[model samples]
Every structure is written in C-alpha cells, then in structure tokens.
Target: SEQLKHCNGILKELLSKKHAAYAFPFYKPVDASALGLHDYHDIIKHPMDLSTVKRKMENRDYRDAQEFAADVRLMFSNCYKYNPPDHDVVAMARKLQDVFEFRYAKMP
Candidate 1:
C-alpha cells in the first residue's frame, strides 16, 4: 500500500485529462517497428510508456517514489531523443515533464 502511495498519486494527477491531456499521447505503448520506424528503439534503448509504468505500479515493482519517477522521466526524455525540438511531440513531452517536475518537487 505504501509502495503505491507517493508516485501513484502523482501519476494519477498527471494522467488527469483536465489539464495534462497532452500526456495522453504517451498513455499507451507504440509500435514504431510496425509503422516502419524500426530504429526508434535503437536510439531509445530503454523504452518506456505510461502503460508499462502503470503495470509496474500495480505489480508493486517500484521500491520507492524515485524509482517510479525515474520511469516517468525516462519516458519523456526518450521522446526528446526520438523527436526534434520542432516536433509536436517534443513540445508535449516538455509540457508534461514540467508538470511532473513541479508536482514531484512538492511531494513529501
């Protein structure tokens, strides 16, 4: 129960559609290979998605809030590497990242 409290609450806040809907693009896993972007994973050696994070949360795989935060941060940073600064996803990732950092900083 304690394992799922901290980061899980932050994730719930981030996943809310009211303001963080931009994060919706990363809610599910992407099949870049099927879309002919096979090299996507080549650059993103440690691929991450909200779905994977949620699953890990449910499994109690996270030892602490930092571990969960690390995964969420990895997901957004991966997008930065895969897309250029001019890409729409890059903008979205930055927005979501900012929101996450603000919330994470205030966590107890």
Candidate 2:
C-alpha cells in the first residue's frame, strides 16, 4: 500500500513516460520510504534528467532485439555494474526476444 502511494503520487511526478516504460513493466513502482531507500530507486525521485528520457522515448530507436540485448549488457558491464536492474526486466527481455525472433523468422 505504501509503495502504491508513491507510484501514484511520486512515481509519475518524478519519472517520464519512458521511465515508466521500463519501471512500471519491470517491477511495481516503488516507495523508497517503504523500501527504506528514501529518495533513491527509479521508482521515484526529483529533478531528474528529462533530456535522456526523450532520447529513448521513441520505440523506433530500439529497432531490433540485438540492440535490446546490447543495452542490457552495457547496463551491467563493470562500467557501473553499479547500475542494478530490476529483476522483472529479465522477463520483459525474454518476451521481447520472442517478438524479435518472430519478426526475423517471418522475413523473406
């Protein structure tokens, strides 16, 4: 219930439509207070980067499954490996792979 509150109020306020594109699907919107992280987590925040949001917003930018796979690799690749991914993203990943596979398989 607590996280739900943040998701409704803070989550939308802090994040972009693209943020929700990753966050909402990967996991439930988080309430940092409930998680004890307070002011952290993509679930909610303030004064975020709007510029990057627009960059990734277009679905066409994603173009293919290889790009998706590459993005995930870079996300965790020692560069930040510091960047933690929400667990559910793996599920989203497999599903997207199916989408790419079908698109490719049907190609002449």
Which one is best on TM-score?
1
lDDT of the candidates, in the order given: 0.83, 0.36
Considering summed lDDT, which 10 consecutive residues are worst modelled in model 1? 1-10
Per-residue lDDT of 1-108 in model 1, one digit per residue for the tens? Answer: 564586788787777886555887788886896778878878889989888998998888998888988899999989988887899888888888888898788766
Q: What overall lDDT, based on C-alpha atoms, would model 2 receive against the true structure?
A: 0.36
What 10-residue stretch in candidate 2 is worst by lDDT? 45-54
- In model 1, state the lDDT of residue 44: 85
Which pairs clash in the backbone of model 1?
none
- Per-residue accuracy of model 2 over 2-108 as CA lDDT, tens digit each: 32232223223323354455434323333447857553544332222223322433434545444433443332232122224554555444443344344433422
- RMSD of every candidate to native, in Å, equals 1.7, 13.2
**Error of model 1, residue 64, in angstroms:** 0.7
Superposition error at 97 for model 1 (Å): 0.6
